[PDB]
Write a protein that binds this DNA or RNA. Structure first.
Ligand SMILES: CC(=O)O[C@H]1C[C@@]2(C)[C@@H](C[C@@H](O)[C@H]3[C@@]4(C)CC[C@@H](O)[C@@H](C)[C@@H]4CC[C@@]32C)/C1=C(\CCC=C1CCCC1)C(=O)O
Ligand SMILES: Nc1nc2c(ncn2[C@@H]2O[C@H](COP(=O)(O)OP(=O)(O)O)[C@@H](O)[C@H]2O)c(=O)[nH]1
Ligand SMILES: [Mg+2]
Ligand SMILES: [Mg+2]
Ligand SMILES: [Mg+2]
Lengths: 199, 670
RNA sequence: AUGGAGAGUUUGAUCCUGGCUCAGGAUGAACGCUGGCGGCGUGCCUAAUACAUGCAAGUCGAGCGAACGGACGAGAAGCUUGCUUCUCUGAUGUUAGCGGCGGACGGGUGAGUAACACGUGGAUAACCUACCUAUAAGACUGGGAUAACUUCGGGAAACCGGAGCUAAUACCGGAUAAUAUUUUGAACCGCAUGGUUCAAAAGUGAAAGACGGUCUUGCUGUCACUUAUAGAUGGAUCCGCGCUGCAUUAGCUAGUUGGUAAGGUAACGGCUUACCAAGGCAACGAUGCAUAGCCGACCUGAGAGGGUGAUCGGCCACACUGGAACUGAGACACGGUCCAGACUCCUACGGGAGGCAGCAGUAGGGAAUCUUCCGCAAUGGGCGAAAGCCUGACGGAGCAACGCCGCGUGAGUGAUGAAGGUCUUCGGAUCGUAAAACUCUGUUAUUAGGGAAGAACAUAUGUGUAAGUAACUGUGCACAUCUUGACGGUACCUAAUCAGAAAGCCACGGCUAACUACGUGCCAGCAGCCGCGGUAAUACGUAGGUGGCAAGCGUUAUCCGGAAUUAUU
């Protein structure tokens, strides 16, 4: 991916398992760095808003500029700004592929789509930023239908959200409808992010 | 497409000689003959064609004041033609250019011009070559006739005589050598063969065998020796009356090297200075060239004359100025001919050309391919020999003055300008009085900045000759919280060059330890300002040994004022003196001028430290006042016939004589 | 409902008032450090400074004469029947010249302009309009020249001058013809002036041929032509309203304000000129001074508002400075003319040539802004019936992280918490799943193949069908067939090889996300503001770690915000 740093250190900073396993927080749930251990300072409100924004951004593996642009368009959509931003983040091809389970890690799914092993409606899409919409299908490239990584990931029967309908035999997923807040991760307080981008 | 002339057929040569030897006349005649089946010289280098060979010619100046041009031309040139006045042979500037060419390893051919002049003596000129220069030079021709009688030239290599029937340079008759001169021609040929054999072992054996040398074999041996810079062919003629110019061009073709025959060039990578890169004459290699001249042409704009060592480059492309580390757009490429400038689409290795459009590319810079990062060896120019304090007559033009100075420094590496902090004056350094005079006139007219020049001011120093205990007391207690300070300091003359030394012999805390640094700072500040003539005081030991202090009134400033008052009283009581910088001057010159040099040194109020031989000359070591060293180069050159050279560096400070010190004090006071 | 956050700083402490400063957005940006790629944009803001060099406006032989070349192919035999001339016929063509049209478009710039310049809304019963389209009537009969060309003469050249001859769709006389112009009768109508339509007389105003078809002692197709009428297009004038600072600018104006007459213009009108009067403007800001192209829009703000007028489009103005007209439907004309002035260059000294605020480029100024590129293949324009030619408009390459957007610099398992850096209470803590090792992928890169669209066409050729003709060619249309790409063998697709080439910038005292050690010691230094530094500095410099961003990151400059700190809200 574009960010190639210690995701474990990032998870420790942000107090969330970006991978979802919890391995990062199992042993050392405190922040990285020399002062990590014995850290007892309290975060200001701006610090809390920044931490929430960074949690969501590093969870979805986006850069600040694209994150802000997505926030803007979500705000321009009708509805609740934070929920719309979260569902739009989910609707990204990386997120859809990861939820379908064609890869174990979000960064792995990003690299797969970037190297072009995925097809939407039977057509290649190299851009992880691609925004999927209801009624679309995500497939896999024929030359890569038998990739070790993809087959191994499909073996592990991960949970498939309600807004996605996946068939592992064909390695074919369908984006049935737009997600909901309950389906989307609950470890994120979208109101804090909305206020952060308010100021 | 394809280069019109090959590396083997390319010739880069420079014409060099003493003043008025005939460099320009020879260059003009060369261009005239090459341009036939309004000759100018404004072009830095001229391109011509002779017998299917491309010849680039650079004409150099003779004066020692303009040695920078000779240096920068010999840096990029392959061969040289050294012109000698027939009546005088080798002259001092002949020696200077010969030494520069030897340093740069440039093969040379000598051309004895002015054979028609009264007093012309070819044998004397050759003997001067042997003695003055210590050069393995031999004639390859003989003159039949001297002065007005000069009418033919005997080529010795092919033992063939050319008769010139007129001064027009045409209608030359190729005839057999006359019988009366045949013996002399054969003797000269034997001498030439011996001279070449002294360098060539195979030819030495061939000659010792008494077998007849082939024309081709002899020419090959001469070419080898010349290109090895072990032999010097000597020709004769008169450029003014058009005799020997064709033979001189033929010798240029036959004996002077090509960009292949010349030794290779070594450069450093930008990121790997230790790394060495050899840039051979190969079109297929990467492009590397050296920009050796920069001028402005009123029609085409800035011209950057450069010599290409390796590779090729096409007009309308991008190159890298590795020295500056920037990118340059080569928009147009020009070559100057005898009568016109021609735009050329490509330049190959071993060619001298001019780029139009280069910005921020100075002489000595390297222009390399965008991908490449080579940097060729730059040129080292002599340091200034004369210095003058310059200043504009109108202060409103001082910014113009600075800009002009910068531009002049960019145009001329040897001309320097710098500001002196102690005196504040702007000092211009140059190769000689003539150089600085020309530059001053150029600033006055070309840049319209009228300036006046003079001897630079000399920064003097003061010191204490006698020791004394003194006391400084500053007590302003008129009302309220006042100001109190008291010190008792022993001032002593320190050993010269040891600097200021502060000692703290305070016992019992009579002066609180808080204020002692303030006392030292006050002494330093008061010594910076002179006590006798305003010049800094130096080489003094100040020992603060006693004092007083009032707890409420005493303060840092009060103690500094007390120290200053103590210094004033010590100046009154210690008989201060004025010191002047003394320079270590090393003068190198032929032994026959040693008496004159030492006499001039002692007249400059300096002393002769010693003497010692060095090489074939002598070196004199002396100490002279910097003030008395003004205009020394001119006097040295007059004393040594231009053969003397010198260096000077600061050595120490010495006491100024009584009258000079009194004059300085009076001038500073009023 | 879709929309609005504050913080520091005056005090021993406090509340208030109050300025100052910061957090945000933006840029035609510049600079510093750094730097992989692709797409789409953007790129002299300064000197409306001066310009070398190349190019940026031609076209028509189906208007005209003349000249070059001279096919096919005429004659003697030099006995060389393959080469020969002039005594012929003489084709496809080409061109110096006259003539038509174009050159007033397209393109550049923002100097001037405070003005009906621009915007918006109207009016002209006060207007002009080539090429284009439609309708009606015509295109008849004569003439004299002059370019070209030949010859002489004068000039360095530019170019002139004399003589001789030659055309036209060049020019001119005459006939016929108006809603055009005058006069007398009308009828109806409007908004003063007036407007519309119907009669009868007087004066007067045109033109052309070219290339083809046919039943060829005469009709006809296409283009071209004249007049009249309309349409369309383009231009012109007038008016309401809107549109900038200064009163330490209060008076301004004498063709000025009105009238009568005349002239003038497409046109009304003091537009101009004579005579009569003394008017006209102005605190609702005249006059003067300063500044400025205007607008669609652009930035900012919750809004109200504030700021701006790059790119792109509309309008205006200008083309070295100033004045003037001629040609022309259209100009008082960027690459036209004349004069004056300043400035370059040539001269034979008598005289001549010129104007990058066209595209590149040069010098200069500047913190700063591109290559003297390919092509008319697409769109558009000029001429022509058409093929076609010209087009630095334009379509595309080159250069620049200048902006926005997209994708990279790897992905999975990895405790065995390796070595090493830093700190340490000497237990250890941290860089750290980070690393190494294993496994995988090829975005991207490299190599080799395939390779678009952008292309409609026009023209040419067959077939029909509509008008008109006696018929025919032609005309328009419909359907058909071959041919046209600079970009460029570029994008893109397919196959193979390697994690291997591809991470830097600022910050960490509060604001404000991020703290430890060492060095220094009111020095060196930092700083947006409060301030920090005098020996145990989270504020200086380095190191480790951390935070924010990421091919960018910071600094500076400028605008709006925060500022309810001009407060209508
Ligand atoms: C070979 C040639 O042509 O030399 C020329 C070129 C020359 C070397 C010139 C002398 C001098 O002006 C030079 C300097 C250093 C001057 C200072 C700067 O302006 C710089 C940029 C400049 C560079 C070169 C320059 C212009 C020459 C020259 C001497 C002229 C004769 C005399 C002068 C007084 C005595 C007689 C000559 O003709 O020999
Ligand atoms: N007698 C004589 N005079 C000459 C000869 N060549 C040159 N000169 C003159 O000597 C002077 C040298 O001038 P120049 O060529 O400028 O020489 P430079 O100073 O060496 O460049 C001029 O006056 C020439 O005319 C020659 O062969 N004979
Ligand atoms: Mg000379
Ligand atoms: Mg202006
Ligand atoms: Mg014009």
């Amino acid at each position: 991916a574009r960010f190639r740093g210690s995701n474990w250190k990032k998870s420790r900073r942000l107090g969330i398992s970006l991978s979802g396993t919890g391995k990062e927080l199992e042993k050392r749930p405190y922040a990285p760095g020399q002062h990590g251990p014995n850290q007892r300072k309290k975060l200001s409100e701006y610090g809390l808003q920044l931490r929430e924004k960074q949690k969501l951004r590093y969870l979805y593996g986006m850069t600040e500029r694209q994150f802000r642009n997505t926030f803007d368009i979500a705000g321009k959509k009708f509805g609740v700004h934070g929920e719309n931003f979260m569902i739009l983040l989910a609707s990204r091809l990386d997120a859809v592929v990861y939820s379908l389970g064609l890869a174990r890690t979000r960064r792995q799914a990003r690299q797969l789509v970037n190297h072009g092993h995925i097809l939407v409606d039977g057509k290649r899409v190299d851009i992880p930023s691609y925004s999927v919409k209801p009624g679309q299908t995500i497939s896999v490239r024929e030359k890569s239908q038998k990739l070790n990584i993809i087959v191994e990931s499909v073996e592990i029967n991960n949970f498939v959200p309600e807004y996605l309908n996946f068939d592992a035999d064909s390695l074919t997923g369908t984006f049935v409808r737009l997600p909901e807040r309950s389906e989307l991760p609950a470890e994120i307080n979208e109101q804090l992010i909305v206020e952060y981008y308010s100021r | 497409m394809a280069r019109e002339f090959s590396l083997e057929k390319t010739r880069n040569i420079g014409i060099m000689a003493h003043i008025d030897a005939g460099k320009t006349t020879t260059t003009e005649r060369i261009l005239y003959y090459t341009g036939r089946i309004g000759i100018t010289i404004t072009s830095a280098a001229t391109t011509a064609a002779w017998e299917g060979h491309r010849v680039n010619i650079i004409d150099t100046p003779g004066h020692v004041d303009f040695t920078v041009e000779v240096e920068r031309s010999l840096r990029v040139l392959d061969g040289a033609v050294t012109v000698l006045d027939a009546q005088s042979g080798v002259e001092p500037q002949t020696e200077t250019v010969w030494r520069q060419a030897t340093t740069y390893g440039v093969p040379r051919i000598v051309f004895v011009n002015k054979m028609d002049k009264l007093g012309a003596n070819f044998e004397y000129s050759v003997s001067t070559l042997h003695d003055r220069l210590q050069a393995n030079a031999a004639p390859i021709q003989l003159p039949i006739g001297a002065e007005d009688e000069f009418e033919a030239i005997i080529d010795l290599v092919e033992m063939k005589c050319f008769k010139y029937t007129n001064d027009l340079g045409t209608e030359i008759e190729e005839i057999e050598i006359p019988e009366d001169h045949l013996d002399r021609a054969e003797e000269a040929r034997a001498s030439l063969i011996e001279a070449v054999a002294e360098t060539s072992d195979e030819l030495m054996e061939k000659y010792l065998g008494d077998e007849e040398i082939s024309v081709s074999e002899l020419k090959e041996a001469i070419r080898q020796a010349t290109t090895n810079v072990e032999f010097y062919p000597v020709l004769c003629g008169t450029a003014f009356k058009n005799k020997g110019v064709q033979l001189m061009l033929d010798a240029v073709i036959d004996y002077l090297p090509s960009p292949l025959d010349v030794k290779p060039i070594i450069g450093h990578r930008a990121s790997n200075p230790e790394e060495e890169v050899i840039a051979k004459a190969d079109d297929s290699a990467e492009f590397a060239a050296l920009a050796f001249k920069v001028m402005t042409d009123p029609y085409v704009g800035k011209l950057t004359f450069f010599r290409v060592y390796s590779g090729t480059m096409t007009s309308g492309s991008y190159v890298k100025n590795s020295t500056k580390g920037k990118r340059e757009r080569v928009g147009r490429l020009l070559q100057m001919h005898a009568n016109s400038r021609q735009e050329i689409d490509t330049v190959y290795s071993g060619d001298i050309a001019a780029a139009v459009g280069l910005k921020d590319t100075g002489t000595g810079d390297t222009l390399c391919g965008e991908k490449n990062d080579i940097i060729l060896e730059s040129m080292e120019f002599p340091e200034p020999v004369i210095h003058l304090s310059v200043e504009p007559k109108s202060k409103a033009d001082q910014d113009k003055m600075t800009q002009a100075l910068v531009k002049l420094q960019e145009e001329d590496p040897t001309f320097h300008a710098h500001t002196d902090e102690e005196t504040g004056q702007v000092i211009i350094g140059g190769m000689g009085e003539l150089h600085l005079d020309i530059l001053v006139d150029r600033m006055k007219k070309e840049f319209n900045v009228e300036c006046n020049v003079g001897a630079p001011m000399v920064s003097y120093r003061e010191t204490f000759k006698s020791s004394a205990q003194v006391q400084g007391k500053f007590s302003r207690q008129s009302g309220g919280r006042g100001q109190y300070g008291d010190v008792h300091i022993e001032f002593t003359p320190n050993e010269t060059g040891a600097g200021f030394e502060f000692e703290n012999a305070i016992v019992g805390g009579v002066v609180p330890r808080e204020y002692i640094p303030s006392v030292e700072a006050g002494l330093k500040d008061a010594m910076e300002n002179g006590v006798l003539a305003g010049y800094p005081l130096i080489d003094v030991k100040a020992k603060l040994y006693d004092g007083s202090y009032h707890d409420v009134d005493s303060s840092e400033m009060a103690f500094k004022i007390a120290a200053s008052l103590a210094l004033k009283e010590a100046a009154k009581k210690c008989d201060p003196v004025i010191l002047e910088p003394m320079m270590k001057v090393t003068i190198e010159m032929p032994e026959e001028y040693m008496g004159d040099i030492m006499g001039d040194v002692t007249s400059r109020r300096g002393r002769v430290d010693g003497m010692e031989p060095r090489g074939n000359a002598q070196v004199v070591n002396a100490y002279v006042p910097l003030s008395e060293m003004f205009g020394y180069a001119t006097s040295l050159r007059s004393n040594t016939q231009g053969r003397g050279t010198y260096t000077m560096y600061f050595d120490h400070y010495a006491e100024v004589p009584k009258s000079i010190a009194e004059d300085i004090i009076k001038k500073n006071k009023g």
